[PDB]
Amino acid sequence: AETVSFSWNKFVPKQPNMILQGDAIVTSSGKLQLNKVDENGTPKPSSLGRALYSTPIHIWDKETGSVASFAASFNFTFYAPDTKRLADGLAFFLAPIDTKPQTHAGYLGLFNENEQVVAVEFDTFRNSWDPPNPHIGINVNSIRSIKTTSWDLANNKVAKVLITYDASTSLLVASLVYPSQRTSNILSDVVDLKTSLPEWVRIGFSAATGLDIPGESHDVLSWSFASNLPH
Amino acid sequence: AETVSFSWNKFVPKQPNMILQGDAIVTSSGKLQLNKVDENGTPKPSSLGRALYSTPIHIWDKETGSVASFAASFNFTFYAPDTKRLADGLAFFLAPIDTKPQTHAGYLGLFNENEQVVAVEFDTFRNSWDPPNPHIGINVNSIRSIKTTSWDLANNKVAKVLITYDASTSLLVASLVYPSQRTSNILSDVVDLKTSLPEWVRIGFSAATGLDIPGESHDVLSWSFASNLPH
Amino acid sequence: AETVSFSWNKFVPKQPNMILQGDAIVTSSGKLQLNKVDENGTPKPSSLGRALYSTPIHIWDKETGSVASFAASFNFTFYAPDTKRLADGLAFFLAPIDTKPQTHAGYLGLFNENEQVVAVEFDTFRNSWDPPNPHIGINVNSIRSIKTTSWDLANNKVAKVLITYDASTSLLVASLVYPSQRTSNILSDVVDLKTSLPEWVRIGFSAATGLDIPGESHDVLSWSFASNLPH
Amino acid sequence: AETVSFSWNKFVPKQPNMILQGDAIVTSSGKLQLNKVDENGTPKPSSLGRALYSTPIHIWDKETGSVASFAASFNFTFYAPDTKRLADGLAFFLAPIDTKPQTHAGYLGLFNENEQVVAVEFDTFRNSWDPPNPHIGINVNSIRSIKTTSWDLANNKVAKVLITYDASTSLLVASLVYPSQRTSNILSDVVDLKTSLPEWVRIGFSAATGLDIPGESHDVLSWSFASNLPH
Ligand SMILES: *[C@@H]1O[C@H](CO)[C@@H](O)[C@H](O)[C@H]1NC(C)=O
Ligand SMILES: *[C@@H]1O[C@H](CO)[C@@H](O)[C@H](O)[C@H]1NC(C)=O
Ligand SMILES: *[C@@H]1O[C@H](CO)[C@@H](O)[C@H](O)[C@H]1NC(C)=O
Ligand SMILES: *[C@@H]1O[C@H](CO)[C@@H](O)[C@H](O)[C@H]1NC(C)=O
Ligand SMILES: [Ca+2]
Ligand SMILES: [Ca+2]
Ligand SMILES: [Ca+2]
Ligand SMILES: [Ca+2]
Ligand SMILES: [Mn+2]
Ligand SMILES: [Mn+2]
Ligand SMILES: [Mn+2]
Ligand SMILES: [Mn+2]
């Protein structure tokens, strides 16, 4: 019966418990910038960042056949100079220890244009596989989400997000909420970890600006997470 | 900095920590029946039950001006012999210590046809003030909800529900989920406790069958809850 | 799998979640006075107070045979005008719902000079059954402790106390610590709840001044507690 | 306000969240062997192991001046073929990220015969600086403990240990308990982290067999730990 939890209400520059990738960095202001931006703070096209959590997570044990439940929360934001021309998006995810980045822009640095990753996307941009309108999605080893739901996204406003995975029912659930606007979104579906990730994994976020365009920055303010893996 | 939490995965007949009201009782089977039903288990019109939690909850302190945050979860179900003719509904709520029941049927035993109660309704029945289709609602000292959202309800299937109240932003958030169906609903809005309940309160559920008709039973399987009231 | 927890860092006058008995009251200053004292704050002989916690605790279930584990912490103090002439003591305890007080002075209001109570005593006074020097003791249905250990008590100084009961090993453990003095005491022994209390109980403290003399007041500053009762 | 916690009831061979050093390894049997032993399981003189926890711990922040509180628990054991001739001991500790081992035998791999380490020792062996009889000690940047207390140690029997550090009072407290024997030991003292470790640290255990002799193996069965570092 293994557990773990952590939580921060700010990010400390150069925390040794974290791992930055791509343009992803930790402002002194405490924010987690994953995207590169102008002196003017303008997001910079073809930008890319990821950020993982040092300790790896024992998602599930093969001996016991046990699968864990975890939940994670965090508040992110996005800045976008032209709310008409948006992209590319943000994700939270579970990968394996060795995970380096991947395709930028529409692949949210998670998938490859070509080719054991699970995640929740906050997609700003209508790709070919994307449905209409910024949505939220569950990605199971694929940028084409198993299920989606509009995301009543809102520029510059903060959003609290909560993600849960119930081993018992095998149900990832994600809800995003915008206190500023008193609006809210939720999504749910089954996901079989036992067959989509390694007995151990590392979690983190990923985020991408557009190619042709800047789109929107993506900074994360806080993160908490916990897991129980039963005997 | 006051806190409290409890949680049960079943109900024990005659738990001294609880309080039954109306037809509300605790089956040996461990369920929390709030409605009276046939030998055949058929809900029985004009039925009514409530069930409160012994210890009262210090929702907020006037000296300090502090307001608490709490969250509560629980899984309920409903049985309805004629999925066409449904009613009347279920609620979870915060009232003051002395709260006895009130109007039955459409008033979900919470309000009076006439006349400091806050709650979340899972309304099966279209009253006059009700919108169309079973919804979910936030009730603030009134059976006419401040905001609502369809409830993709489903007979006989179990639903996990989670309710949160963030003092900081003053935002009650409710999400109901039906793992069986992989569907999900969420609702959010601000609620000022400081002006809608007493420094201390008691929480519990309430549930009602129809007048003219039976409608649907309402049993609750589990309950967990916690609160922090800061210094 | 039933749980419960609460914690306060101060006492609120007239908390509806608590129960006072005897002279036990809640100063505005936030302290929990269990003993009556002078305008000068001088403890008043033959004084007596208890204070219980509203919600009852399901210590153990007969159907399942399950026994719970709990731990409790709290910081108390004692004021004693004549550190030479001390008494009578303080206790923390588990009794059954209906528990009213009992013998004063040396019986710490827990036992009767004559005659299902479990507790930990912080004895200031050498009774006949008492060993030498203020000690700490485990009382199992009897003022004559099953085991004891000196208590390097210290007037007017605050003491943090922690009590644990491990169902698995059936071991109550108590440790008292005096940060002020960087000193510390610990005691341990087995206790069979299953045969010394009711499936349900209520917990609280009890405290007594001397007969012939005042001895020492006993106020409690904070209290936290938790319990898991497994399936 | 940063926190973290983890806990395991067994050790998984080759957990990527841990770090072995010296002879320290993880038996398949789930135990954490820190010492090398015979095919017969006989401890092997001049043996040495340490084991650290992957994620580093932000013990305290210089900007804020904040210091954290943590507590840790774990159950260890020791096997010793000749209960007359014992050594060398075991420790739990906080060091800085880069910590590799150090002096063996009496230095419990923590200190150097010569020369920012804080720890609690379970010393089997009377060095020169050691007091009489296996004790427990608080080591602050030195194998000569700031304070000690006998350890009513017991061969082959399991011991539950609990360590707490209260930032507020700056008091490390350690209590060791032997349910098997219903005995118990406790130690307490102030320790200024702010001046004895780095803003960030890594924790783990260390353990040593004797030089001339085998003494006693040292395996650890379980570990839990948590920390809050306030804003
Ligand atoms: C999200 O977290 C940030 C940083 O911890 C905080 O300043 C902000 O107000 C938070 N927003 C919500 C909605 O909790
Ligand atoms: C809800 O709780 C009940 C009783 O604790 C349990 O048997 C049922 O499977 C639960 N359903 C979900 C979706 O967790
Ligand atoms: C004990 O609790 C009181 C009241 O909460 C506090 O003011 C006091 O400083 C505490 N002492 C210790 C040693 O924690
Ligand atoms: C200590 O932990 C081990 C492994 O988790 C367990 O098997 C053993 O019985 C425990 N002993 C105590 C006293 O809790
Ligand atoms: Ca896209
Ligand atoms: Ca209605
Ligand atoms: Ca006595
Ligand atoms: Ca030594
Ligand atoms: Mn998509
Ligand atoms: Mn309604
Ligand atoms: Mn005694
Ligand atoms: Mn020593």
Q: What is the DSSP letter of C37?
A: B
Q: Using CA of residue C78, residue C82, residue C86, residue C88, what is the dihedral sign?
A: negative
Q: What is the DSSP letter of A5?
A: E
Q: How many angstroms is it from D130 CA to the middle of ligand 8?
A: 6
Q: How many angstroms is it from C168 CA to the middle of ligand 4?
A: 10
Q: Ligand 4: which atom is nearest the Cα of residue D9?
A: 5
Cβ of C115: how many Cβ atoms within 10 Å?
Answer: 9
Contact D193, D96 (CB under 8 A): no
What is the spatial distance between Cα B217 and Cα D79, in angstroms, rounded to a whole number? 62
* CA-wise closest residue to A38 among A212, A225, A214: A214
- Helix (H/G/I), strand (E/B), else coil: C100: coil
Q: What is the DSSP letter of C6?
A: E
Chain B residues with CB under 8 Å of A187 CB are: 184
Burial B69-89 (b: 16+ CB within 10 A, else e): bbbbbbbbbbbbbeeeebbbb
List Cα–Cα distances, D33 to C155, D36, D41, D154, D172, in angstroms. 46, 7, 11, 18, 26
Q: Token pair of D169, please? A: 């009072």
C3 touches chain D (CB under 8 A): no
What is the spatial distance between Cα D123 and Cα D154, in angstroms, rounded to a whole number? 13
* CA-wise closest residue to D161 among D136, D143, D139: D136
Cβ of C82: how many Cβ atoms within 10 Å?
Answer: 11
Which chains are adjacent to chain D, needing at least 3 Cβ pairs under 8 Å? A, C
Chain C residues with CB under 8 Å of D188 CB are: 177, 179, 182-184
What is the spatial distance between Cα D142 and Cα D126, in angstroms, rounded to a whole number? 15
Ligand 3: does its nearest atom lie under 6 Å from the Cβ of C160? yes
Of the residues D136, D140, D186, the best mutation for testing chain C's interface (the one with the most C CB atoms within 10 Å of its CB) is D186
Q: What is the DSSP letter of B142?
A: S
Contacts of D211 (CB under 8 A, 6+ apart): D45, D46, D88, D104, D105
From the list C171, C184, C185, the residue facing D182 with the nearest CB is C171
- Helix (H/G/I), strand (E/B), else coil: B180: helix
Contact D174, D161 (CB under 8 A): yes
Of the residues B73, B177, B191, the best mutation for testing chain A's interface (the one with the most A CB atoms within 10 Å of its CB) is B177
Q: Token pair of A38, please? A: 């102008």
Chain C residues with CB under 8 Å of B2 CB are: 6-9
From the list C183, C188, C190, the residue facing D184 with the nearest CB is C188
D1 touches chain A (CB under 8 A): yes
φ, ψ for residue B181 (rounded to 5)? Answer: -100, 0
What is the spatial distance between Cα B170 and Cα B190, in angstroms, rounded to a whole number? 5
Contacts of C42 (CB under 8 A, 6+ apart): C81, C214
Chain D residues with CB under 8 Å of A97 CB are: 16
List Cα–Cα distances, B192 to B142, B169, B170, C110, D66, in angstroms. 14, 10, 6, 45, 34
Ligand 2: does its nearest atom lie under 6 Å from the Cβ of A15? no
Q: Using CA of residue C110, residue C112, residue C117, residue C122, what is the dihedral sign?
A: positive
- Answer yes or no: do C9 and B231 touch at CB < 8 A: yes
Q: How was this structure determined?
A: X-ray
- Helix (H/G/I), strand (E/B), else coil: A160: strand
Contact B108, B211 (CB under 8 A): no
Name the domain count of chain C.
1
φ, ψ for residue A217 (rounded to 5)? Answer: -70, 170
What is the spatial distance between Cα A106 and Cα A104, in angstroms, rounded to a whole number? 6
Q: What share of chain C is helix, strand, coil (3-state, %, to 5)?
A: 5, 45, 50
Q: Taking CA B174 as the corner, what is the angle to CA B172 and CA B175, rounded to the nearest 5 degrees?
A: 155
* Closest CA to ligand 4's atom 12: D160
What is the spatial distance between Cα D175 and Cα C71, in angstroms, rounded to a whole number? 15
Contacts of B115 (CB under 8 A, 6+ apart): none
Contacts of D172 (CB under 8 A, 6+ apart): D120, D138, D163, D164, D165, D188, D189, D190, D191
For chains D and A, having 3+ Cβ pairs within 8 Å is answered: yes
- Answer yes or no: do D17 and A55 touch at CB < 8 A: yes
Contact D106, D213 (CB under 8 A): no
User: Token pair 């009072």 is at which residue?
Assistant: D169
Q: What is the DSSP letter of D41?
A: -
- Answer yes or no: do D5 and A5 touch at CB < 8 A: yes
Residues lining ligand 4, Cβ inside 6 A = C 169; D 9-10, 75, 158, 160, 179, 221-222
What is the spatial distance between Cα A49 and Cα A47, in angstroms, rounded to a whole number? 7
Ligand 1: does its nearest atom lie under 6 Å from the Cβ of A77? no
Burial A60-81 (b: 16+ CB within 10 A, else e): bbeeeebbbbbbbbbbbbbbbb
Contact B204, B51 (CB under 8 A): yes
Nearest CA in chain B to A185: B186
- Answer yes or no: do C9 and B17 touch at CB < 8 A: no
Contact B75, B180 (CB under 8 A): no
Q: Using CA of residue D30, residue D34, residue D35, residue D36, what is the dihedral sign?
A: positive
Alpha carbon D39 to its chain centroid, in Å, reads 26
- Helix (H/G/I), strand (E/B), else coil: B97: coil
C5 touches chain B (CB under 8 A): yes
CATH classification at residue C149: 2.60.120.200
Contact A174, A161 (CB under 8 A): yes
- Answer yes or no: do A55 and D54 touch at CB < 8 A: yes
**Structure's resolution in angstroms:** 2.8
User: Token pair 């118990």 is at which residue?
Assistant: D184
CA atoms within 13 A on the CB side of D102: 20
φ, ψ for residue D227 (rounded to 5)? Answer: -150, 140
Nearest-ligand number for the alpha carbon of D219: 4
Length of chain D: 231
Chain B residues with CB under 8 Å of C17 CB are: 55-56, 58
Q: Taking CA D148 as the corner, what is the angle to CA D143 and CA D153, rounded to the nearest 5 degrees?
A: 100
Strand partners, D72: D163, D225
- What is chain C's alpha carbon radius of gyration, rounded to the nearest angstrom? 16
- Answer yes or no: do C17 and B61 touch at CB < 8 A: no
Q: Token pair of A13, please? A: 């520059």
Cβ of D231: how many Cβ atoms within 10 Å?
Answer: 9
Q: What share of chain A is helix, strand, coil (3-state, %, to 5)?
A: 5, 45, 50
- Answer yes or no: do B173 and A184 touch at CB < 8 A: yes
For chains C and D, having 3+ Cβ pairs within 8 Å is answered: yes
Contacts of C3 (CB under 8 A, 6+ apart): B5, B6, B7, C226, C227, C228, C229
- Helix (H/G/I), strand (E/B), else coil: B227: strand
What is the spatial distance between Cα C96 and Cα C93, in angstroms, rounded to a whole number? 10
Residue D106 domain boundaries: 1-231
Amino acid at B185: N
